[PDB]
Structures are given as C-alpha cells and as structure tokens.
Amino acid sequence: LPQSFLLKCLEQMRKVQADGTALQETLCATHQLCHPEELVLLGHALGIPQPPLSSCSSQALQLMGCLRQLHSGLFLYQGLLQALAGISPELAPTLDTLQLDTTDFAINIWQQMEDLGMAPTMPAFTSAFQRRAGGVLVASNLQSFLELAYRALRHFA
Numbered sequence: 001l002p003q004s005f006l007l008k009c010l011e012q013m014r015k016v017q018a019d020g021t022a023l024q025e026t027l028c029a030t031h032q033l034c035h036p037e038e039l040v041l042l043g044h045a046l047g048i049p050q051p052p053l054s055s056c057s058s059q060a061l062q063l064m065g066c067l068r069q070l071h072s073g074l075f076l077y078q079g080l081l082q083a084l085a086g087i088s089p090e091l092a093p094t095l096d097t098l099q100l101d102t103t104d105f106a107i108n109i110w111q112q113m114e115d116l117g118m119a120p121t122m123p124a125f126t127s128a129f130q131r132r133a134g135g136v137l138v139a140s141n142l143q144s145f146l147e148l149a150y151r152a153l154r155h156f157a
Contacts, residue, residue, distance in 0.1 A: 001063075001112070001153065001156055001157060003157075005108075005112050006153060006154065006157060008108055009105070009108065009109075009150065009153060010150070012101065012104060012105040012108060013105060013146045013149075013150055015101050016098065016101045016102050016105055016142065016146060017143050017146060017147075019094070019097050019098040019101055020098060020139040020140070020142055020143050021139075021143075022094050022097075022098075023091065023094050023095065023098060023135055023136070023139045024036075024136055024139050024140065026090070026091060026094060027087075027091070027132055027135060027136050028136075030090070031132055033132055033133055033136045036136050036137055036139075036140040039133050039136060039137050040137075042133055042137075043133075043134075043137045046123050046125065046130060046133075046134060047121075047123045047124075048080065048123055048134060048137055048138065048141075049076060049080075050141055051069070051072070051073030051076055051077070051141075051145055052069060052073070053066070053069050053070065053073065053145065053148045053149055053152070054069065055068075055069050056069060056070065056148060056149055056152035056153075057152075061152065061155075061156075063116075063118070063156055064118040066149070066152050066153075066156070067109060067112070067113050067116075067118065068113065068118070068120070070109055070149045070152075070153075071106060071109045071110055071113065073145060073149075074102060074105060074106035074109060075106060077102055077138065077141075077142055077145075078099070078102060078103060078106065079122045080122070080123065080134075080138050081095060081098060081099045081102065081138065082099070082122075083122050083123055083124070083125065083134075084125065084131050084134055084135050084138070085131070087128075087131045087132060087134075087135045088128060088131070088132070091135070095135070098139070102142070
C-alpha cells in the first residue's frame with residue numbers, strides 16, 4: 001500500500017483509540033463500568049455484533065479481503081455509535097468526536113479500495129444503563145479491532 005496511506009491510517013486509528021479511551025475512562029470513574037471483560041455476556045444479551053477480521057489474520061491474509069472486512073466492520077461500528085445516541089449529555093460530546101473520527105477513517109479505507117479497484121441489524125439500547133455498558137463494550141471492541149487491522153496493513157508492506 002503507499003506509505004502515505006499507512007501513515008494516514010496510523011494517525012487516524014490512534015485518534016479513534018484516544019477517543020475510545022476517553023469514553024472508557026469517564027464511564028468507569030462515573031459509573032464503575034471499568035472491566036469490559038465482565039460485560040461480555042451482557043453485550044451478547046444486547047446483540048452487540050463483533051466484526052470479523054478473518055482475512056486480516058495470517059492464515060487467511062488477502063489484501064482485498066482484509067480491506068473489505070476492515071471497512072464493513074468500521075461501517076458497522078458507525079451504526080453502533082449512532083445507536084448509543086450520545087449515551088448521556090455528559091458523554092455525548094466524547095461520542096460525537098469518536099463518531100467523527102471513525103467516519104474519517106472509514107472514508108479513507110474506502111477511498112483506498114477505490115484507488116485499487118477493489119471496492120466495495122442494529123442493537124436497541126433503551127435504558128441508560130444499556131447505553132452506558134454498550135458504550136464501554138463498543139469502545140473496547142473498536143480498539144482491539146483497529147490494533148488488528150493495523151498489524152495486518154503494516155505487513156502489506
């Protein structure tokens with residue numbers, strides 16, 4: 001991939017990671033939601049999908065496949081962030097930024113697929129406790145997801 005795409009991906013993913021850590025440190029301080037490791041069953045109950053990056057895994061590494069999963073996964077996360085609907089007033093600015101920065105990264109992934117000619121159901125959280133635990137889950141899912149796509153992308157070089 002061109003170095004400028006890798007360099008732009010690095011800058012964009014580290015901002016979405018910083019954004020996610022901000023959401024996570026507020027809801028832990030504020031509502032004791034600090035161990036996303038515990039919320040797994042509840043995520044499962046809530047219906048919070050978890051994007052596969054299989055084609056970005058060594059035994060299945062394929063540039064088109066990895067990029068297309070990466071993007072479809074980012075797109076999903078876009079919906080998930082839309083569905084949290086700010087979580088609570090105190091948190092809606094941090095969600096807004098995270099939403100802006102995840103959308104910028106997904107436009108970049110898609111733009112690149114087009115340059116290469118290889119282009120191309122949402123949870124209901126109705127209580128505030130659902131949006132608060134959904135917010136900590138999605139934020140740490142997104143983080144690991146990105147760390148995965150990056151090691152894959154860096155090796156496609």
